[PDB]
Amino acid sequence: EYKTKVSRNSNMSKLQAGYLFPEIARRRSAHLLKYPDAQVISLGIGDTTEPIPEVITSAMAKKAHELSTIEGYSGYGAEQGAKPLRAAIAKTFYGGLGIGDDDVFVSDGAKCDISRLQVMFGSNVTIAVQDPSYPAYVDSSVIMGQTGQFNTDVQKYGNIEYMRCTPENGFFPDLSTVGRTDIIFFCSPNNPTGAAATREQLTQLVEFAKKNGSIIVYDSAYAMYMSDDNPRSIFEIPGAEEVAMETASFSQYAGFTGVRLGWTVIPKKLLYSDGFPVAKDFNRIICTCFNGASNISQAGALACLTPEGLEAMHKVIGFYKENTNIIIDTFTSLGYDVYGGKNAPYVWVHFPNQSSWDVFAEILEKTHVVTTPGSGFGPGGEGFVRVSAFGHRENILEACRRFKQLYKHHHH
Amino acid sequence: EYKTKVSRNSNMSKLQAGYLFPEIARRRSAHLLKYPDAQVISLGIGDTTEPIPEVITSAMAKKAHELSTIEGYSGYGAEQGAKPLRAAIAKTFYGGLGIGDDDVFVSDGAKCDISRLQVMFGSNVTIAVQDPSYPAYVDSSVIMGQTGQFNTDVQKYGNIEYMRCTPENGFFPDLSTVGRTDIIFFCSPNNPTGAAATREQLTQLVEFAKKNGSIIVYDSAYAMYMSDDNPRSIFEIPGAEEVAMETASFSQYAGFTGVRLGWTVIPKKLLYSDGFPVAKDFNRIICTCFNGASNISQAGALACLTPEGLEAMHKVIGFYKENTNIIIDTFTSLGYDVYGGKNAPYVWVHFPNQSSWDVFAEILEKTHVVTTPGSGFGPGGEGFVRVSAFGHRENILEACRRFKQLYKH
Numbered sequence A: 001e002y003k004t005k006v007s008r009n010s011n012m013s014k015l016q017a018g019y020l021f022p023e024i025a026r027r028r029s030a031h032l033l034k035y036p037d038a039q040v041i042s043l044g045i046g047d048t049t050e051p052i053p054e055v056i057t058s059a060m061a062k063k064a065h066e067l068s069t070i071e072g073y074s075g076y077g078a079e080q081g082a083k084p085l086r087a088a089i090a091k092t093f094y095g096g097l098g099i100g101d102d103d104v105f106v107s108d109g110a111k112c113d114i115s116r117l118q119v120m121f122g123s124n125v126t127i128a129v130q131d132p133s134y135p136a137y138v139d140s141s142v143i144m145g146q147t148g149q150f151n152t153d154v155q156k157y158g159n160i161e162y163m164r165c166t167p168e169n170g171f172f173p174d175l176s177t178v179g180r181t182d183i184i185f186f187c188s189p190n191n192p193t194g195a196a197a198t199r200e201q202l203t204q205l206v207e208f209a210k211k212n213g214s215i216i217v218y219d220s221a222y223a224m225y226m227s228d229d230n231p232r233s234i235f236e237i238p239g240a241e242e243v244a245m246e247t248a249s250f251s252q253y254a255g256f257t258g259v260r261l262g263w264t265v266i267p268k269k270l271l272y273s274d275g276f277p278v279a280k281d282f283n284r285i286i287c288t289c290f291n292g293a294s295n296i297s298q299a300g301a302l303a304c305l306t307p308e309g310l311e312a313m314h315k316v317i318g319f320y321k322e323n324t325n326i327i328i329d330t331f332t333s334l335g336y337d338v339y340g341g342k343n344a345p346y347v348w349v350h351f352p353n354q355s356s357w358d359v360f361a362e363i364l365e366k367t368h369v370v371t372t373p374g375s376g377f378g379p380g381g382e383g384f385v386r387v388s389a390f391g392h393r394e395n396i397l398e399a400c401r402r403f404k405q406l407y408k409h410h411h412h
Numbered sequence B: 001e002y003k004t005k006v007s008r009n010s011n012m013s014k015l016q017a018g019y020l021f022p023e024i025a026r027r028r029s030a031h032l033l034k035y036p037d038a039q040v041i042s043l044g045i046g047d048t049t050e051p052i053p054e055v056i057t058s059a060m061a062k063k064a065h066e067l068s069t070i071e072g073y074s075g076y077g078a079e080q081g082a083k084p085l086r087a088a089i090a091k092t093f094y095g096g097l098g099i100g101d102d103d104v105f106v107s108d109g110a111k112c113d114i115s116r117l118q119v120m121f122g123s124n125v126t127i128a129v130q131d132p133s134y135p136a137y138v139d140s141s142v143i144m145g146q147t148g149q150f151n152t153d154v155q156k157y158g159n160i161e162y163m164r165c166t167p168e169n170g171f172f173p174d175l176s177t178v179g180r181t182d183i184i185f186f187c188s189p190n191n192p193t194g195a196a197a198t199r200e201q202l203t204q205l206v207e208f209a210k211k212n213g214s215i216i217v218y219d220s221a222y223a224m225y226m227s228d229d230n231p232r233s234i235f236e237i238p239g240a241e242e243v244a245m246e247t248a249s250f251s252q253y254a255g256f257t258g259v260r261l262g263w264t265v266i267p268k269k270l271l272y273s274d275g276f277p278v279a280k281d282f283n284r285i286i287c288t289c290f291n292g293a294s295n296i297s298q299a300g301a302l303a304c305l306t307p308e309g310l311e312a313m314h315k316v317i318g319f320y321k322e323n324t325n326i327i328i329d330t331f332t333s334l335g336y337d338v339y340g341g342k343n344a345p346y347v348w349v350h351f352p353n354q355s356s357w358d359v360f361a362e363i364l365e366k367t368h369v370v371t372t373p374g375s376g377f378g379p380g381g382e383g384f385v386r387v388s389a390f391g392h393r394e395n396i397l398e399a400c401r402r403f404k405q406l407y408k409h
């Protein structure tokens, strides 16, 4: 059996298992072999379920049609994205926050931008993440060589600064206790906890990055779910343009999870220690490692950013926020400490004194409802389960009655 | 002025200039500033110009409409791509070559795959490339930390094996002179030379990778332009499956340069030195660093691989092959040494005693035609210019009559 003489990338070897969501997919499949007739409801992966609004799909169809006309055909786009789309994103989301069209970089979504940013930052930076949070910041970090090995004692990669976000701290790190790193990944509203940082917290965040000379990578993918009067962009914090960039996506606003369209904003005043603008290196990465978001996806996003698009998106968002209420009420009425839900389509449920993988296995086993074990998001998620509110209304309602049956004798 | 204390990535500092194609777009823009009424003809970046066939755009439009219905909506797909699409690619382009559906990974294009492969290989591998070739291979390698600095005497980045491809050698390198590396990026039909490696030459390539325990990254971006009877896939060479992967795209086949859809094939028997299957690590990258190609672009790609889609694509390709011949005839009648254009929609024109960039500048200034300086494709490209054949027939004709007029006396 022939083998090349190329060594496996030693950063790939560092990873402890596969990406969490494939692991759940595999456990779901195993469950359906065990229970061939089970009506499985997924509240696991944060995947949108409701149709894209027609105003948006019509623009995509019209663009597809135009590609077969002489006047309408277009080929390669500027890798930064169509100017009018960059302009629409700059005005709609950062109007008055001093962001130009040219600070916006359109991508095929936030997961890809995080990895492209990690390529730009390179192997020699250190990172901080919320603990828990979205597994891609850590995993991208390991793959690029920014970490040591996984320590199975603490459930942590070496050299990553994990900032615990717990009910006892209001799901915001105690920054006086957080070590300096080059990069701070900060997601708000947070996946998985649902917690949105207040203006005073984000102010502390920017102050902390400024004294440490760090870069905040701010993930606003769920900002449109905000209910409380908290900032939706890091650039609402004066000083942020010196220490922060932001990544966003239409995945969770327009149901573009399969259509693929996000953006990153890197401000002009964000500079490396030698004065070099970070936006110039990202622009290099985006020109060399990427050939632009799909022309049809970009036509769809442009349609989102119109009175009719914004109205359609708000309505779908409103639907998921009502699902989220149904879920919150269910657990609260069952006597659980339930977190998130207010500002985010995730409910973060406290299952103390159990391993979250066990709670996950139990719920799956007995109710045929898939959830996401907290420990999939880091050692700070242990003791919790994330429940996703994306689903048709009937499925949400049915999941909740299955919860009520499962848990009626736990509480008290 | 405030600065962070994050050190700039030193691999980013290594890079000599901006990426080639943006730099050309920038000179085109300046030219239009200088002469706002210039009727500019763009034959630089190899960007397709003709409309996508209706059978293909119809499928994409249909998928968009379905996304607004209960029953037709879909969110996240497999990061590897829709199974029917992996099945269509495996059978259409590799039927009989031992390629399974699960060895195909659908991407948003070849440039993206090249960089994802490079994240996957990591910074500890050494690469070889053809010289000249498509600059993304060298630049991704620099970005990933696989290289030394740029040496301006030789015009090469340190620690890359530039395999010399010349008119004299048939643009196929003498492999006895090529040092061992981990990765060998090989493009056939090659961009910028248009040269397609024969069956015998690829056999030598596989034998060389096999003795050196190298991995071949075979880029077949232009394979559908083959006229000569040469293999279109590296997997046509027995033993390729132990040493090679392939990257391709719908960009040049269907005009998806803006729609975004390609694929990589990584065979089961491709293993690192510890025996670990390389495809398995690519799959981890693709799950961690990517969220799948656009559902609409996937539906377009699926419609391509049907009798109606293959006929329609074939017809567009033949239109650009006609364009390329017009361009060959023009330059050969002006008495230039002209290469390529047989198996590729590019012509590779020798301008002796003159820098590629000055030739680019002169053509653009005098005729308002954008071309590509050959030195953008590495040091072996110096003294050549690449001319792309993509364009409406009237624009190719006008460009050619402009060349003749400029160069005839």
Ligand SMILES: Cc1ncc(COP(=O)(O)O)c(/C=N/[C@@H](CCC(=O)O)C(=O)O)c1O
Residues within 6 Å of the ligand: A021, A044, A045, A046, A047, A108, A109, A110, A111, A112, A134, A187, A191, A219, A221, A248, A249, A250, A251, A256, A257, A261, A262, B291
């Ligand atoms: C905080 C955060 N950032 C980025 C993303 C991905 O955005 P896209 O690549 O634009 O669809 C998401 C989507 N997350 C879902 C989907 C899973 C995934 O994208 O890996 C989840 O955790 O269940 C996210 O929550």
Ligand SMILES: Cc1ncc(COP(=O)(O)O)c(/C=N/[C@@H](CCC(=O)O)C(=O)O)c1O
Residues within 6 Å of the ligand: A291, B021, B044, B045, B046, B047, B108, B109, B110, B111, B112, B134, B136, B187, B191, B219, B221, B248, B249, B250, B251, B256, B257, B261, B262
């Ligand atoms: C040998 C080869 N491999 C990969 C690509 C990238 O194609 P896609 O990302 O699929 O559209 C290309 C496309 N090259 C163009 C476009 C510029 C670019 O992709 O950077 C050119 O050489 O003019 C290529 O020539």
